[model samples]
Target: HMKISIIGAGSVRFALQLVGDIAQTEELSREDTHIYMMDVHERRLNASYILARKYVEELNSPVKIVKTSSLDEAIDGADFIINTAYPYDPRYHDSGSQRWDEVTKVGEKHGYYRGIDSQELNMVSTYTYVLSSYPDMKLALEIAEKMKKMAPKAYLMQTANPVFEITQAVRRWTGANIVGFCHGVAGVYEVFEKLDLDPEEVDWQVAGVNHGIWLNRFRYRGEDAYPLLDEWIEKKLPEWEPKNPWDTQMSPAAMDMYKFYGMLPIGDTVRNGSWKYHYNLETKKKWFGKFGGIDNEVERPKFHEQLRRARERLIKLAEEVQQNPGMKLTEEHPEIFPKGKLSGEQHIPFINAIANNKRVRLFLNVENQGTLKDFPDDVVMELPVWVDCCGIHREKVEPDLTHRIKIFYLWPRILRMEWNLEAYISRDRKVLEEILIRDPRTKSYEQIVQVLDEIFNLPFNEELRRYYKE
Candidate 1:
């Protein structure tokens, strides 16, 4: 059997969705597939195991399945390890719960978390939010090391945010044979499917930090498709109301952010705002009440809420599969599986790539590897790469003048600045200055210094303090 272990599967709502989609996919589900749901919380793990098994049965798939609360045992012989666990409680992060508990309270009680409040981010409430916003690169590397030790052949498919940073960190740290997966690139392809455009008809060029990263040029048969997309945004969006506006649908706040940043981000607006604004003290209280969350209960230190919300979505989907044993396949099946392999009509860029171990390619936020020729090592440069069982292999991109300068001038400082926050905390003044001067958000030399000082003056988490200077 092919063993697939999911870490943090206690909160398996997304996993369930993907699995459901997989069951319907012609290639994924098989009698040899064994999914081991693992989590630190035994109760959630049990629930996840039952739920996943139930769904598999409902879908009439022959995949073997089991659950383990012990992560070490669960992954010992796993072929694929998927992680979606949050550091704190996952419940508090979802279903308008995050807005209330992680944001409203933090931003209100703490001065630093204010700018439109992101959930559970302590740095937001400290004006030092950006310092902490750096992707959990260290944590991911640690996990990669563990996976390397436990299941050396197992491919670690990362779905974590800041895929650019975390993926690069893991590659550099462990040299693991793995691939970072995401819905962002598939997200755009799904949009193309929605528009009846062939995925093959369009050639894409993208570069930016991570999700909500830039789509440099979207071409149809080598012609720019942005004009059509621009038309869609202006004309199509006006008539639409998001199905689950607060949760599932796109956030207008994100669009507003794009307008300000001169680029519309790919995913949620708030997540990418780590550097754009300081969500710290003096500002937190002012914005807390404005972004009222799902329920008053959301603001009350409750993580069960996120579990409930995630479960709610799963329950609804599971019911459909239960009633209809066969996948609802059609021309559209490939067009919408998770991120636009609807009715089995489209081939999603990354979802099935790992499952099938195909040499599929896409843009990623990893190191330059001389992919950009003259870019620095620390640059969190985005480049197109071929992906398979061995993770990302950057494609040789001959960037033009625009992309070349944008990457060189922007990413190096952004990377160093992220590293610098820790350096500055450690009083590594030299690297701190080098990064600050490279930040795109820094309007002037004076502003760069001011931001450096501003972020530094605020305190950081006690646990993370060891990484910075004394």
Candidate 2:
């Protein structure tokens, strides 16, 4: 009996596909359920709304659908505000057109890594300057105003990039109830199905910051995962090659770092953790044989088929949402957002739990706050929590100091690099001095900064101005 709305509903296909599942759910389906769809583009919004409502109708779903081009209008009177707005393009990773190979093309890039990431980056170019400079902070502040005014009663479920940074800012400035959801979390469960293990039964321990972390532990009834994953890697070594180089992509990308650093990462739990570090190239070749090394702009189309398939699935889902309205019934759908099984699109369950007094066990981003005694509590970190109508409650697990150190020393500056990216993207001399000195990759910080300068000065994007000063 809750009213829900989708903001920025046009740029995605699969995002729309969820309508069929939610409206038809046994617990939620009813003639009284209301659904609102919003977008900036009138045409796209109308097309999506038309299709989505069709699905509701076809499924005989009683959900009422509304279409709008005004964000303020779309959000008005909503109880749960979904924050997966499409900003045309988000941002980019590797620029300068330099073939990022040599050290780049390792592991899953050869198989399925590069292609997936490449298209992802190209499309998200809109957020290019979100953290570009001080001026962009206004964008965040503007979001704050929007959250405060447009829909004060709504709890937020953000589906944005730099999910940590944006979600953190929104929560702090507006005091809105919002959590970011990425598709990566469900992938851990997907891999489990392939391995014949029950993902739900495993007392999984994921660590590190964002994409750079490792699973470090996945125990079945408290048994270790050594022989299993080692054997898994060995089995997939051959026939890993595909027609196009980029299409053979896969995950556990940070596993190289995990192994080099003495750990293990669940495959594809989050995307794009591969580029933040370096490893022994020769070893990568042996471990990930026949899989194409990570690089962009391949000659033909051997790889990237998965991208096409995902895209195809997206379009199909959009149509299904329009054609199939009975959603409170069907089962569902991870990386770069979080690690968990992701079949259903309704984050509203969690939002409603907090907003309306329902209780649930949720994987959330919260202040470490004495959760890990040794780690700083102020840093917003992700962990499983007992969330009820009260808000996010932290759960305890034994500490893995190694994983903590990996994030502490290396990944902390992800925001600095992602937002302004001035230092990381432009390789400013002082920026190089600071980051190289901070980077875990450099040895003794000797010639690292200068070499970084050589690479950075080559070219920079215009939108990438200096970070916004307060």
Candidate 3:
């Protein structure tokens, strides 16, 4: 018997999928497993809780679900704690639109990119800079504080982002066993499908920081697939580009990197690859089509609406099953529901590996144990990990010459950008100002001081603002 705690179960999309997958896992699906679901928002929490409860009942699974708002109660005696919580709105404004725009829009006024990046500039302009003083870091620290007191042996599975920074902070600041999870690897899988290659016939690997993960290997069976991949770029990509504007957001940007950087980038690399693509609205459209790049003005709302509709469809199907006692979920309606499909996430498998000794290989954000020899061992990097009762073992695969050179020479400075963030958060004013000056967007001394003053003293950022007051 074991207890698994979910810190934020209000998100219907993540909660339902995660819960459904847990129910589907043979090792975890049994009667002895109990789940503690927690969310600060009661209404949304109840919404997901109802869906999870219904799943267990319909599937005739014996998983117990407990709901709570208290962090202590939710995590007490838990074997595993998964945190998907984002501190939203007036409560904890990490990078709420207003504060984010305060820096981005401010930079835009002076002809900077859509937003500042950690790679090109200093701490102030980059979104990573905003996270240096984010409230959620405090929240994560608080959660770590509780786990240390209540469940010292518990492993923390973090599904939040600014993943690289948060995971590193928690790992360094606390003594908790932690693994960070993200869906960027899914984008790498997309490369195979996009190229019309059979995924089963392909062997691929992506490793690096969260958004910056590189496609270190892409093979067809035991042979390199680069020739075929390059041929697709030469022949298929141009033809495919115009026909699929929305999907092609990453293609041009990725192709651009494949040209110069030698290896392909997956996930957020499409936008984050080059400041060239993100310079302005026009450049964004040029690189990422009419949608104005990833999650632009036109795209974000539609993305949210699609998410809302997906949840609505789930609710609609659940209601139908509730109304009729004999009714069980089925694939009878493809538009609304699919049969026997579970989220292909790695969380349950990671747990199953530890509990049932079901060995699994996955790309996870774990503290570097010489996975990338050049990278700092203290920082968490997404790399291939093999897990079982022996615990998560970091792969000892050495990076190639080109990979080492690119990272050693080009990547290290940007890596320092994150390191400087650690310094800034630790209240090193000189280091903070030093990195602040490194921001290409910060042209004037007045701009640097003003930007800092504005962000650290925001109206809704009460406690964080107080941290800067002294």
Candidate 4:
């Protein structure tokens, strides 16, 4: 039986979804599995507590639910400590369309997070937005430090972005068995589906940093699928553009890169690529068409609004389940999990694999222990891994980019940022500033100083602010 701890229990959507995933697992649900819900905000914590408790009851499983505002209480003796805690509410920062456009316009002055490469980040918009992440990073480090002392053997699975950087910091700073998780690889399966290929029939492998991964192989029934993908791009994709920018059925940028890199850039890599696609409205339109790139100014707000509405529905459903004690919260209800299937987040499968020693193969972000042969173990790359009672281990795999792109392009860019993250986490201001200076979004020494000063001087994010001196 596993004692699972959720640090940010206030995250209702994530917590409740996790509850559903746990409910499905036979190894976890059949046993006396206990879930500890911890958050600083009691009201939010209570919401998730009630939500989880009611759902678990609905499942009629042996799983037990515990909720608390105390972090120490939640983590102590826990088998797995999931760190989903965000120091600040993201909804406050960028909520709707008008605000997003306003912010990006300010970023257009600095480089729009294109960094020193294209020189588009400013003190107000892009710098401030990037600043928000440091607080979360600090909080993550603090939690990892706590988990190291409290639940020494527990897996600190991070479900956060800046995933690669934060995961790297934890491993370097703490003696904890830590791994990061992302759904980017799973998201690419939808691309396979879009290409009229059965995703399950298509065997694909990707390797590299978190957001910028190279798809080395995408095979269909033991044959290469790139030719088919190319044919689809050449033949079918021209007329497939949907009015709604959210559609990923075909991406001009991704297709263009596939033609250039030889290996396809999967998922966000297509979006996260070259500073050119993100320079401003026109370039983004030229690259990504009417959609204005993935989650552009227009789309991001809508995404947040959708998230808000989902929460509203979730809260109401929790109340309904409370009022009618026997109400089912299973997949039968579209509102609970609208996909009518398992969530892409693979926490449950990981737990099931480990607790029962199922020896399952999974894609997760862990230290690259010679997994790609040339990459150092400290480089936290998302790779195909096997998990069992022996814990997570890397699988040996060959990457095509080794001779050129990996050596010259992706690794250098990723590793430099990794080093900068290490320096930042360690409060090595000089080193951090050096990396920031080299950042293409960073235009001048004066601007870099201004950006750093303003980010650290801000009253709100004391967690990160403490690390710097004005």
lDDT of 3 at 276: 66
Q: List the global CA lDDT of all models.
A: 0.50, 0.48, 0.66, 0.67
The residue ranges of model 1 lying beyond 4 angstroms of the native Cα positions read: 25-28, 89-104, 107-110, 113-130, 133-139, 186-200, 227-265, 268-359, 363-365, 377-382, 388-392, 396-409, 420-470
The TM-score values for the models, in the order shown, are 0.64, 0.66, 0.86, 0.87
Q: Predict model 1's lDDT versus the native.
A: 0.50
Q: Tens digit of lDDT per residue, candidate 1, span 204-316?
A: 65555444355555678767776666666677655544333123123343344444544444433233443323333222222222232222223223434555765665555
lDDT of 2 by residue, 1-470 (tens): 46677776663454455565555454555665677777665545665675566556556668778777777775677776676653432133221111222112321223323321122211111222222222233344455567668767666666655455565555655566566555344445644654578777777765433333345556776787545666665685243433332222233343444455555544332223334421333433443333423333243122334444554455565566557656422233322111122345437457546655667666556556776565565555556567676777776654463653455432443444343344323434465355445434445554554443333332332322232111
Write down the RMSD of all candidates, one decimal each. 8.2, 8.2, 3.8, 4.0
Per-residue lDDT, model 4, residue 5, is 88
lDDT of 3 by residue, 187-305 (tens): 76678877778888887777777666677778886788878778878887665453333464236667877767677777665555545665555775676666665434345435545
What would the per-residue lDDT of candidate 4 be over residues 129-195, giving only the tens digit for each residue?
3422465567778878777788887888887545766787778777567888876666567678777
Better of 1 and 4 by TM-score: 4
lDDT of 3: 0.66
Residue 211 displacement in candidate 2 (angstroms):
2.5
Q: Which ten residues in a row have the lowest lDDT in candidate 1?
A: 119-128
Per-residue lDDT value at 273 in model 4: 58
